[PDB]
Design a protein around this ligand. Structure first.
Ligand SMILES: CN1CN([C@@H]2O[C@H](COP(=O)(O)OP(=O)(O)OP(=O)(O)O)[C@@H](O)[C@H]2O)c2nc(N)[nH]c(=O)c21
Lengths: 747, 21, 152
């Protein structure tokens, strides 16, 4: 085992900063490798493949190394390329296309090292492009394949064009013939900003082809990619040439899944750094390679934030560039990209904090500049990206003792209170309060911003002493209050509630009970949990009907209407205790009581949390059934090799079926609600002849888009019913556009 | 000066609580 | 297979703290810790209400249950909490991203815990609060003030 880990340490150690020159390390390691080749053939093969698949940010470095070994051995090289091609085949069969891209890139840079003859690579690329000519195949395939080809170009384009420019030109003509007839319906659902200025958010393929065209016009003269093999001239030039076998991409299969299309996130510009190095242009291939390298570095060290920040700060390049802006832009692109970021958002905020720690002299200014820039473009940002921005900002400021120059944003005061900028400011203040106390928010926020600060989080007990005795149930409320101070049992409370004047459901009964209960347990979250759990059988008996569940939700909202966090946590606990099912918490968000608070964040956070709990419950029951089935099968085969369990399996099968049915019903109810509300709004606006684009409509439509983006993985199963019942042709085109975008997202 | 008194959970009787859902 | 450098996760590793009142040997405690889903959140202020903890640790994923750190006799917060998540992955994410992140201008210390039974929310300290609160000597407004030893 010492041999294997010694080899791994040797191979990995190349690339890191060291006193000796890079060429010396490569030559020395190559010498050690040839010194140990006859006994460690397969070991070094495995290590090289693994490093070709898990270290794209050193893709050049190892490629150079692989040439030196080839210069020392021909059989080694041939077996290495055979291995790599078989690994690529496996990767394409595993539906893991990212490593497929990395492999292709490696092969192309290996072609640069005089290992594989150019014509074979030309044939491989021709097959890739010809994949676009396949019939009745998803466009996300054709897409990925063209993307792999074009992304491989920035590394071996000079060589292939200078060797086979004729076939290259034919291939480019085919690529244009394909790209001119692509479908762009998915772009609006994926753009962070819908505005075309000052930085259009163009699709990744279009931008990549623009970079390729610019590079071609520049005679394939890049200025950023590192090419260590240039110094290794003689050695490599006296190396034999291998030929890759004819490659045929695996045929399309129903179970195959391809990466969904994405949109490049562009928000900076060279004019933003009048002092630093000239930032690469938005259509320069250097900016694509830089973004790709940063993405790989973040994906290779996403576990240790310290190491990730250290790697990002020390990113090497052929020519000096404004690496601070690139890092900030790529991090924000990961955070904001739809449907979901590569990793958990808190990872990105902590990574930014660590990066500021490493480079306090320059990075904080860049972060502040990006913050202001995002604020100034809030008028069109997607609501999902807005939510991510609000969360990030709040947490990130909380870290630095809520110290922002709010006066610089006084503009929100002048414009409409419901406009995106003032709404964002109010939500940020509310979240900041959620991490602090109301007095803190007041003290920090300028006086002129006081109209935006969230309301004080105080309980509103309708049955207070000042409250008039005329309202029914005041005596019952006092009796319940005394009982609560007297540690009364459930039967006592039942007796107390029996003498309530009904105007199997008594809305006044539930109102008085819930009101009193909540009021008494209104000094901390934990007391509220204890009261709900202890007296959860009174809720369960009184809220048998879904109407009762809705009434309990409404009363709970009335009690805590100056504190959204309490709403969220209390409905989370009620749902967990099966006090109210998720459907009831779905029909309560679309109710007329919350119309004034429909666009607030807490409502959508509550909705998302309920969906998440429902999904986790379904997955947990499915996993339990899977474990039971596996145990039954193992016992059966072991006994054979020598009915109660079958009954339990059947029961769990029926339970999982019912859980899936309730999940489906939840999603269907949510979408039906959205459809009804948006249809009514559009009809009213059309009759009034007013502008259809208002902040409320944008918020609602982008929330529907957010639901689709978050839970496409499950809605893929409901696609049929969704298309048959909710999103039909008769529906208004505005609403149907979201469903069409969702369908095109993976087709 | 934190302008909020500490909460008192004195009788937060938590007997047996599981998540039925 | 997979490079061992990438799989390194130094923020989700067991700490050097072993429970002193646990009913069993260290081995079963380690087994439980390797599969637990509960996080002990330390270095909190007395005044910190549980809504903000719920908000923050929900941001790191869904929360199943939260238990505030009550005093042995006063039944008031002592500056520690237990968060019981629904999945192991959420707890790991919270450790990698919530550990060290400020809260009320106070650094939050998150560590694995072997679960929660009755009697685990009252500080083992004979003064009622936390043992560290009885041994520390530095002033801290969020932690009441000088350590119990300083006063008496
Ligand atoms: C510091 N703590 C405290 N703690 C829990 O918090 C509750 C009260 O503990 P405490 O009053 O700080 O005493 P003790 O745990 O002995 O603290 P210490 O060992 O620091 O002296 C107990 O349930 C204890 O197990 C902890 N639980 C875990 N998992 N990790 C930890 O670091 C800590």
């Amino acid at each position: 085992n010492e041999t294997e880990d010694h080899l791994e340490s040797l191979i990995c150690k190349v690339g890191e900063k060291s006193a000796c020159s890079l060429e010396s390390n490569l030559e020395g390691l190559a010498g050690v490798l040839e010194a140990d080749l006859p006994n460690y053939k397969s070991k070094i093969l495995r290590l090289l493949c693994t490093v070709a698949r898990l270290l794209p940010e050193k893709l050049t470095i190892y490629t150079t190394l692989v040439g030196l070994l080839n210069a020392r051995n021909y059989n080694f090289g041939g077996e290495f390329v055979e291995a790599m091609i078989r690994q690529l085949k496996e990767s394409l069969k595993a539906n893991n296309y990212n490593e497929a891209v990395y492999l292709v890139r490696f092969l192309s840079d290996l072609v640069n090292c005089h290992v594989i003859a150019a014509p074979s690579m030309v044939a491989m690329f021709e097959n890739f492009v010809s994949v676009t000519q396949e019939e009745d195949v998803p466009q996300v395939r054709r897409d990925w394949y063209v993307y792999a080809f074009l992304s491989s170009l920035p590394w071996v384009g000079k060589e292939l064009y200078e060797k086979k420019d004729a076939e290259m030109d034919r291939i480019f003509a085919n690529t244009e013939s394909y790209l001119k007839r692509r479908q762009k319906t998915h772009v609006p659902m994926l753009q962070v900003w819908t505005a075309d200025k000052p930085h259009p958010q163009e699709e990744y393929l279009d931008c990549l082809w623009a970079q390729i065209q610019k590079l071609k016009k520049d005679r394939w003269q890049e200025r950023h990619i590192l090419r260590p093999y240039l110094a290794f001239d003689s050695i490599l030039c006296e190396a034999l040439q291998h030929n890759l076998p004819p490659f045929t991409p695996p045929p399309h299969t129903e179970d195959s899944v391809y990466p969904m299309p994405r949109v490049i996130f562009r928000m900076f510009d060279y004019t933003d750094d009048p002092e630093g190095p000239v930032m690469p242009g938005s259509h320069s291939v250097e900016r694509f390679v830089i973004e790709e390298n940063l993405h790989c570095i973040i994906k290779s060290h996403w576990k240790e934030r310290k190491t990730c920040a250290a790697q990002l700060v020390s990113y090497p390049g052929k020519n000096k560039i404004p690496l601070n802006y690139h890092i900030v832009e790529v991090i924000f692109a990961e955070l904001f990209q739809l449907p979901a970021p590569p990793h958990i958002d808190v990872m990105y905020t902590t990574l930014l904090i660590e990066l500021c720690k490493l480079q306090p002299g320059s990075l904080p200014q860049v972060l502040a500049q990006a913050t202001e820039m995002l604020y100034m473009r809030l008028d069109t940002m997607n609501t999902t990206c807005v939510d991510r921005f609000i969360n990030w900002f709040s947490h990130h400021l909380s870290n630095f003792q809520f110290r922002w120059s709010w006066e610089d944003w006084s503009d929100c005061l002048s414009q409409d209170p419901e406009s995106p900028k003032p709404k964002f400011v109010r939500e940020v203040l509310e979240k900041c309060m959620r991490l602090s106390y109301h007095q803190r928010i007041l003290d920090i926020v300028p006086p002129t911003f006081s109209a935006l600060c969230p309301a004080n989080p105080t309980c509103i007990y309708k049955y207070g002493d000042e409250s008039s005795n005329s309202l029914p149930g005041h005596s019952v409320a006092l009796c319940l209050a005394v009982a609560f101070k007297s540690k009364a049992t459930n039967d006592e409370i039942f007796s107390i509630l029996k003498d309530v004047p009904n105007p199997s459901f008594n809305p006044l009964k539930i109102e008085v009970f819930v009101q009193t209960l909540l009021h008494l347990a209104a000094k901390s979250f934990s007391h509220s949990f204890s009261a709900l759990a202890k007296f959860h059988e009174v809720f369960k008996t009184l809220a048998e009907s879904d109407e009762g569940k809705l009434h309990v939700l409404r009363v709970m909202f009335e009690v805590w209407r100056n504190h959204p966090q309490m709403i969220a946590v209390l409905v989370d606990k009620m749902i967990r205790t099966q006090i109210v099912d998720c459907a009831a918490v779905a029909n309560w968000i679309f109710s007329s009581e919350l119309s004034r608070d429909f666009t607030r964040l807490f409502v959508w956070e509550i909705l998302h949390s309920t969906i998440r709990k429902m999904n986790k419950h379904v997955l947990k029951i499915q996993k339990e059934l899977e474990e039971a089935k596996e145990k039954l099968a193992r016992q059966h085969k072991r006994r054979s090799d020598d009915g109660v369990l079958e009954e339990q399996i059947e029961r769990l099968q029926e339970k999982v079926e019912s859980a899936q049915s309730e999940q489906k019903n939840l999603f269907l109810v949510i979408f039906q609600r959205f459809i009804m509300i948006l249809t009514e709004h559009l009809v009213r606006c059309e009759t009034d002849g007013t502008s259809v684009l208002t902040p409320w409509y944008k918020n609602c439509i982008e929330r529907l888009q957010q639901i689709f983006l978050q839970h496409h993985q499950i809605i893929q199963q409901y696609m049929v019913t969704l298309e048959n019942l909710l999103f039909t042709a008769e529906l208004d085109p505005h609403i149907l556009a979201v469903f069409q975008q969702f369908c095109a997202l993976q087709a | 000066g934190d302008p909020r008194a500490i909460v008192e959970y004195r009788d937060l009787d938590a007997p047996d609580d599981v998540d039925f859902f | 297979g997979l490079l061992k450098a990438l799989r390194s996760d130094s923020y989700v590793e067991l700490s050097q703290y072993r429970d002193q009142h646990f009913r069993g040997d260290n081995e079963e405690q380690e087994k439980l810790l390797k599969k637990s889903c509960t996080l002990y959140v330390g270095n909190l202020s007395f005044y910190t209400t549980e809504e903000q903890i719920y908000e923050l640790f929900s941001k790191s994923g869904d929360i199943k249950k939260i238990i505030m750190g009550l005093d042995k006799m006063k039944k008031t917060a002592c500056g520690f909490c237990f968060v019981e998540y629904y999945s192991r992955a959420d707890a790991e994410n919270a450790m990698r991203y919530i550990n060290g992140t400020r809260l009320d201008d106070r650094i939050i210390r998150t560590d694995w815990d072997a679960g929660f039974k009755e009697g685990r929310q009252y500080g083992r300290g004979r003064s009622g609060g936390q043992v560290r609160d009885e041994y520390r000597q530095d002033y801290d407004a969020g932690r009441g003030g000088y350590g119990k030893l300083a006063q008496n």
